[PDB]
């Protein structure tokens, strides 16, 4: 075995520097640092193509034997869920339902070619649908008259067409913004989305969607509220109008809701019994449409249905740029929110399955998908939380599962779009509510974060409140800023400790922690685990004067008190010897007689101009009353900050630095002993 | 002499903890922590009275012999400057000039009793006057007709009265806000005003005031612009209308401007020749009014003058609360800006003269001053930069200098208010411009901050730009947020270093720095001088895998490449031994053969849940390829973060911690030697 044993002279700063000679670095010209980027070797261009076109990467290396069954089952199980969710989100956007299926096919196909993550199901999203519907209603209210040959029997088809055009324009603008952000390498901002913030934002969005689904379930009409305090206004509106509900719609919605809970719990408790989970949503919609067609609930009890569904695909429609100046803000908000949600899901799924995703490629893929979708009659979309988990939980392994879902959505569009025209809105509302239960389950993080780390609990609660009451567009920004400022709070509330020396060793630990550490007499040690930047210097000085019990101001006051009570280019020395008579010392109230204060800088990352000024003031003031101050553990970075500022214009301040606490202790003790020698 | 010498066993975590026994703390009940606050000893109540009423402190201890002359000279020299500045700021607020003298007397008298700082000259401020004028014009335009018995010969007196009432209401609201903030102990926020931010904000405000003074100097009329892009719009407006200037007003303004520069430079170069500096502003206004009265410039050349000045004080006027819902935002902005500026000046003057100021008492004093001034026909004010520098520079020592200035302003109000009625606006504009030169001089910080610290230069430029183009109300908030986020940027761009061991000692320094440090073979050391919070873990992992040249992913890839090329409750061990055949090692491209990676945690202040997850992933992944990872310098705080999270559910991870880099090196070397022993 071996024991920790080192023998060496006391390493102050000048003693250590005379033993070290700076190395000569190799400068890299900014001109020669650009030439090597244009070698254009086949490997480099192949890597670039692989980066921009991930389909060329994971498709040739497709391991058939263990991917075919999982991909097929996951694709079927996610398409059967994407259909009712697509229709439901279409109605939330104040657009005809067929546009939900239009928006659930083109971007999925494009993301199967341009996407990096291989476990997310891109498609219609509830939050994006809500925001698109809000802007569509804001631009096009229910009071627009068009004399385009239509008689007095207006079916509001013109209003729906204008709303569709508004959604297309804002989607195209959001896609262009996302593409421009992606090519600008901005996707590096996704790292600021901490896990508690994402969980809180998703839960708040889940509450918004759940409360926005109540009017669809009950069947009562209610004007849509968008903006600040939207959730509370919407819920009080639906509560005021609840007296005029539709009994049959509520009954069928509650029945399918209970059936969905029963089936989901059955699958959960019979997980081992199944080779592949049964698609419950498909059975739910089949039952709903069968009953509705059986009893003709559209008119017999005034139970509104999804409506007619035209067939056939549409040729590309070149949009107009006449609405950009009206919806430019909301398009930016849509792009930011969609990218944030999709990057959070892609990152967490990649971490779970052991790989990596690219933020910039995600932005580029979303931008191209949204833009070309706007050319192809499609509104803005992003990743979907519940749908992606359903696709993965059933054995999703590559992105071909999304392609299969897109293909079956195409099949429904072309062939059996008429079959679902009688589906009541209650079934879709209950399906959305039941699939959103997984997001209600995230309240378990409240006691958990309370036990583990209260700062993250504060971030979670602040994000949830800011995204619930205020609009989702600005709640995310507010939560991000609060999360960033929590670091500032942490650096403004550090742990000031006074250290003591373990006997016979060099381990220095807090004096009030372990009952065996003993403070060295005449030497006080202070430690701060935080930088000394502008918003921290004053607190550091106050803590130094309070914890150590050595305040030069009160020392001078007591010295003058004893004085009045008894009576009835070169630089000056940093430490002024105590010009206090020994006879006057008899009238000097007792004290610890501290002769040196050691400052620990091992846990100080940086110091700025305000910090340097405060440190110089501390050194000068403490030296005024004849108390030496040494800095221990000054890293090379902090030494550079001190040198850059005006701290070291007096060369005699070089010797105050040291390398370790024990080095400073040995130096101070040796200096005291040397001063003892010449005393007598 | 003594040499650094320590002999001790290797201190891992369990070895150190078995030698330490936790002390028992003394709990302080939240109930008994409140009882001692109500002792109500005479000393405590005396201290409270001293805190709330600083006049009771520095007045009884007034040292006459060295304060009388300095206070008198400073008070005279600051009153003679406060008068023209008060009149000039009155006209900038779109109120009759007499209200400038009303606002220059009451709050100065009150701050002489309720103020803490003893070197600032409270009074009218250019920025506050500009904002008050902006809100007054916004509420009361030039198109208001009142049929209150006034004939068609309307002198716009009603419009001026409404503007005065608006200013009074907003001033009272701002005063109430300041008082409520002060009693709430909110004045603790003043620490976020770093020096570069304050300097940049003051320079931007100086530019705003200078460009707002051009129309007064030239004599041309120009409608006032308030809000975003106010400076550029105002300067292009005054440039477009310059063709209709008044020659005589410009001539007298330039003459007094040149005289002021000449006299100021004369005082600067004859500083030693004077016992007390001559008041140049008084001579300037005397000359201007003498010439204007001599030639009657009010009508002879259409040179506008300050106008008539009514005498006599006014009885208190109880305001109205009918304008709060219109000006509540601007009152809040006024309060914040005024408190920020005054606290910056008070803090810097206290630091210069060696004492301290209280932010909360400053807020309380400003709130009471503004409120009771609004009762006494006075608009909102705060500290004045140039006036305070003039007061302190001539020998201002206590707050009685402000009282003398208030008394002489009262003398002018009561007796000689008519004498200054013919003073041209050109003289006042040139006086404001010449006294604001000291704020133009602050561009010298650009090369200075460029040389010292580029981050503070970025803060300075961002503050200047955000406060120049955008309005001063929101530029301050934007600059504060940017300054706070610079810390986040600093923690996101740390300095990753790979350390080496100085021979025969225990000093570990960067391997690419000093040419004598030598890396220990088989051991790689990594150090980060930043926390490991959520927005930093990914960069830390990438830097660890790049700098040290030990990437487990590429190691596994190379191992599998050699493999395919050659062929033609208990827990598992953390480190899995390399199941790689020695024959396959012959096909394994050469490497450094690193057997242990040491992570330096001496400069890590805190770690959060994301950081803990990343650290656990690093440990597991590095142990997968048979590479031990040790943590060195884990402080008790970081150990607490790791324990609170789920890092230590496997007790075998306790031994991975250590106390110092050399301890970890010795432990790893000893473990390798022990593994060597049983090999053969
Ligand atoms: C620490 C953080 C929160 C500081 C910055 C907060 C900013 C981004 C917040 C605080 C107050 C917010 C505003 C509050 C209310 C509204 C009205 C609403 O109809 C549109 C958004 C808007 C205008 C918000 C925009 C974002 C906002 C200005
Ligand atoms: C945290 C970092 C990004 C700084 C944030 C600065 C925020 C709070 C600033 C910057 C730009 C500001 C906006 C600029 C202009 C206007 C128009 C005005 O009629 C009302 C206030 C309003 C809407 C401001 C609100 C506050 C604002 C949004
Ligand atoms: O339906 C979803 O998948 C969903 C996901 C997140 C938030 C609200 C939602 O409705
Ligand atoms: O007159 C001043 O002292 C002053 C100070 C700061 C900004 C504008 C100003 O006019």
From Swiss-Prot, chains A, B:
Intramembrane-annotated stretches: 230-241
Effect in UniProt of substituting residue 89 to Y: Decreases salicylate inhibition
Controls the electromotile activity, annotated site positions: 386
InterPro entries linked: S04_transporter_CS, SLC26A/SulP_dom, SLC26A/SulP_fam, STAS_dom, STAS_dom_sf
Sites where a glycan is attached: 151, 154
Subcellular location: Lateral cell membrane
Membrane-side (Extracellular) residue stretches: 94-96, 140-156, 219-229, 242-246, 296-320, 377-384, 421-424, 470-471
Alphabetized GO MF terms: bicarbonate transmembrane transporter activity; chloride transmembrane transporter activity; chloride:bicarbonate antiporter activity; oxalate transmembrane transporter activity; protein homodimerization activity; secondary active sulfate transmembrane transporter activity; spectrin binding; sulfate transmembrane transporter activity
Membrane topology of this protein: Multi-pass membrane protein
Source organism, top-level taxon: Eukaryota
Residues marked Contributes to anion binding (site): 387
UniProt keywords, alphabetically: Cell membrane, Cell shape, Deafness, Glycoprotein, Hearing, Membrane, Motor protein, Non-syndromic deafness, Transmembrane, Transmembrane helix
SUPFAM superfamilies, per database record: SpoIIaa-like
Free-text note on domains in this protein's UniProt record: The STAS domain mediates dimerization, with both STAS domains latched onto each other in a domain-swapped manner. The N-terminus domain is involved in dimerization such that each N-terminus domain embraces both STAS domains. The STAS domain harbors a unique anion-binding site important for the fine regulation of the high-frequency electromotile properties. The transmembrane domain consists of 14 transmembrane segments organized in a 7(+)7 inverted repeat architecture that can be divided into two main helix bundles, the ''core'' domain and the ''gate'' domain.
Record text on subunit structure and interactions: Homodimer. Interacts (via STAS domain) with CALM; this interaction is calcium-dependent and the STAS domain interacts with only one lobe of CALM which is an elongated conformation. Interacts with MYH1.
Protein name, UniProt field: Prestin
Gene that produces this protein: SLC26A5
């Amino acid at each position: 075995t071996q024991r920790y044993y080192v023998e060496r002279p006391i390493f102050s700063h000048p003693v250590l520097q005379e033993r070290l000679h700076t190395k000569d670095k190799v400068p890299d010209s900014i001109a020669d640092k650009l030439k090597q980027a244009f070698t254009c070797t086949p490997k480099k261009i192949r890597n670039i193509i692989y980066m921009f076109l991930p389909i060329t990467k994971w498709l040739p290396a497709y391991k058939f034997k263990e991917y075919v069954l999982g991909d097929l089952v996951s694709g079927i199980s996610t398409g059967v869920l994407q259909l009712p969710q697509g229709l439901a989100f279409a109605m939330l956007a104040a657009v005809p339902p067929i546009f939900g299926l239009y928006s659930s096919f083109y971007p999925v196909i494009m993301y199967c070619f341009l996407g990096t993550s291989r476990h997310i199901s891109i498609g219609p999203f509830a939050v994006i649908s809500l925001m698109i519907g809000g802007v569509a209603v804001r631009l096009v209210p229910d009071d627009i008259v068009i004399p385009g040959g239509v008689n007095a029997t207006n079916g509001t088809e013109a209003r729906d067409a204008l709303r569709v055009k508004v959604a297309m324009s804002v989607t195209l603008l959001s896609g262009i913004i996302q593409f421009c952000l992606g090519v600008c390498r901005f996707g590096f901002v996704a790292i600021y989305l901490t896990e508690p913030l994402v969980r809180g934002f998703t839960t708040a969005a889940a509450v918004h969607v759940f409360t926005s689904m109540l009017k669809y379930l009950f069947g009562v009409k209610t004007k849509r509220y968008s903006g600040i305090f939207s959730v509370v206004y919407s819920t009080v509106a639906v509560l005021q109008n609840v007296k005029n509900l539709n009994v049959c719609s509520l009954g069928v919605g509650l029945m399918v809701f209970g059936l969905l809970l029963g089936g989901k719990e059955f699958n959960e408790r019979f997980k081992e019994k199944l080779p592949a989970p049964i698609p419950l949503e498909f059975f739910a919609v089949v039952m709903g449409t069968g009953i509705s067609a059986g009893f003709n609930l559209k008119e017999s009890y005034n139970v509104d249905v999804v409506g007619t569904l035209p067939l056939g695909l549409l040729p590309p429609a070149n949009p107009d740029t006449s609405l950009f100046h009206l919806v430019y803000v909301d398009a930016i908000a849509i792009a930011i929110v969609g990218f944030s949600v999709t990057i959070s899901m892609a990152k967490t799924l990649a971490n779970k399955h052991g790989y990596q995703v690219d933020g910039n490629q995600e932005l580029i893929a979303l931008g191209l998908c949204n833009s070309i979708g706007s050319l192809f009659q499609t509104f803005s979309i992003s990743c979907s939380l519940s749908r992606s988990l359903v696709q993965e939980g059933t054995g999703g392994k590559t992105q071909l599962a999304g392609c299969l879902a897109s293909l079956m959505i195409l099949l429904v569009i072309l062939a059996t779009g008429f079959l679902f025209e009688s589906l009541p809105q209650a079934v879709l509302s209950a399906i959305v509510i039941v699939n959103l239960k997984g997001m209600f389950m995230q309240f378990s993080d409240l006691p958990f974060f309370w036990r583990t780390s209260k700062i993250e609990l504060t971030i979670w609660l602040t994000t949830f409140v800011s995204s619930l009451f205020l609009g989702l567009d600005y709640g995310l920004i507010t939560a991000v800023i609060i999360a960033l400022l929590t670091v500032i709070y942490r650096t403004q509330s550090p742990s000031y400790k006074v250290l003591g020396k373990l006997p016979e060793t060099d381990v220095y630990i807090d004096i009030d922690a372990y009952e065996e550490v003993k403070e060295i007499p005449g030497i006080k040690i202070f430690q701060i685990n935080a930088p000394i930047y502008y918003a921290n210097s004053d607190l550091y000085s106050n803590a130094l004067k309070r914890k150590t019990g050595v305040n030069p101001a009160v020392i001078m006051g007591a010295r003058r008190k004893a004085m009045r009570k008894y009576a009835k280019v070169k630089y000056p020395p940093i430490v002024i010897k105590s010009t206090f008579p020994e006879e006057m010392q008899r009238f000097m109230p007792p004290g610890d007689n501290v002769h040196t204060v050691i400052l620990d800088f091992t846990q100080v990352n940086f110091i700025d101009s305000v910090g340097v000024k405060t440190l110089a003031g501390i050194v000068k003031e403490y030296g005024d009353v004849g108390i030496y101050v040494y800095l221990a553990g000054c890293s090379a970075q902090v030494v550079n900050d001190l040198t850059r500022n005006r701290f070291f214009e007096n060369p005699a301040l070089w010797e105050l630095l040291f390398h370790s606490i024990h080095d400073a202790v040995l130096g101070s003790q040796l200096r005291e002993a040397l001063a003892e020698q010449e005393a007598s």
